[PDB]
Amino acid sequence: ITGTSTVGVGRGVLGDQKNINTTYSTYYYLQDNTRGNGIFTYDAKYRTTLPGSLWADADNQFFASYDAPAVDAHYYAGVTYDYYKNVHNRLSYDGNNAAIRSSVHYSQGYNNAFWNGSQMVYGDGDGQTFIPLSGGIDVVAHELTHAVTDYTAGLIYQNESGAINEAISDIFGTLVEFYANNPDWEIGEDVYTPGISGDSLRSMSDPAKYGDPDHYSKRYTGTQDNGGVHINSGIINKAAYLISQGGTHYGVSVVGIGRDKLGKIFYRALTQYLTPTSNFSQLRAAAVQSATDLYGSTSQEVASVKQAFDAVGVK
Ligand SMILES: [Ca+2]
Ligand SMILES: [Ca+2]
Ligand SMILES: [Ca+2]
Ligand SMILES: [Ca+2]
Ligand SMILES: [Zn+2]
């Protein structure tokens, strides 16, 4: 890992060619020295022991099918870093350039990805429900954003706190996807269900399309999914979508203010006002205050934040 900074070339999960920052010392390692204290990508070798081995490659070319998840995990970690640096002046997830570690080829047929408190982990999928989940930029940014949340607001992964946590990751996952520029308000569409076109794991524009609630009245109150952290996120995701894009939802009209202002407001909320036990009502209050800080109390931006949360029934 002490070596010389170099640039490798390879193919991502969706077959797209890609330059990646590597480190040469005998082998070429997926180690990016150009971003903070590093981006390191590991091979978990189909096992669940973490992080696994720092990805070594003989010739700095990554075109093998086995390489594809690593290439994207490494690359999109870079893009997500750039986003938080360039757009929010945040240096890595901890704000002090902590090294960003990812492992790919986690387990077998593993249809998920997660941030384990220390690093990102990507399964390869079963090839039917998922292909390698690092292939989705919104997925990578989603998981990396969990790190940002844990180091800032510290939202408990349970009930409404957890649903906000999830929504924050969907929100910034989407905003990274727009930042990289085939952008949309869907989640996981690039790596979800090959064979079936046009679907996704979640929708921010229309959460009900996949059975998730788009209104606080329709919120889940059972025990599954840690109190519906991936389900009730739809309520916050819709609110976010309405802030950005505008629209009329259950008879409540919302004037959009764009994704850039959506991002500034929610980032400020996340890092200045939100706490580990914040509920949806407190999120509203934090978003309204953040918008007030940035744009002023009589501004359109504050009005639209109010309109959006009114629309999804969060008072
Ligand atoms: Ca090679
Ligand atoms: Ca997309
Ligand atoms: Ca997407
Ligand atoms: Ca699909
Ligand atoms: Zn998540």
UniProtKB/Swiss-Prot annotation:
It is found in: Secreted. Its cofactor is Ca(2+); Zn(2+). GO terms for molecular function: metal ion binding; metalloendopeptidase activity. The active site is at E143, H230 (proton donor). Ca(2+) 3 binds at E177, N182, D184, E189. Keywords: Calcium, Hydrolase, Metal-binding, Metalloprotease, Protease, Secreted, Signal, Zinc, Zymogen. Its EC number is 3.4.24.27. It catalyses: Preferential cleavage: Xaa-|-Leu > Xaa-|-Phe. It is an enzyme of class 3 (hydrolase). Zn(2+) binds at H142, H146, E166. Ca(2+) 2 binds at D138, E177, D184, E186, E189. Ca(2+) 4 binds at Y192, T193, I196, D199. GO terms for cellular component: extracellular region. Binds 4 Ca(2+) ions per subunit. It comes from the Bacteria. Thermostable. One of its GO terms (biological process) is proteolysis. Ca(2+) 1 binds at D57, D59, Q61. Belongs to the peptidase M4 family. Extracellular zinc metalloprotease. This is Thermolysin. It comes from Bacillus thermoproteolyticus. The gene is npr. The chain holds residues 233 to 548 of 548 of the full protein.
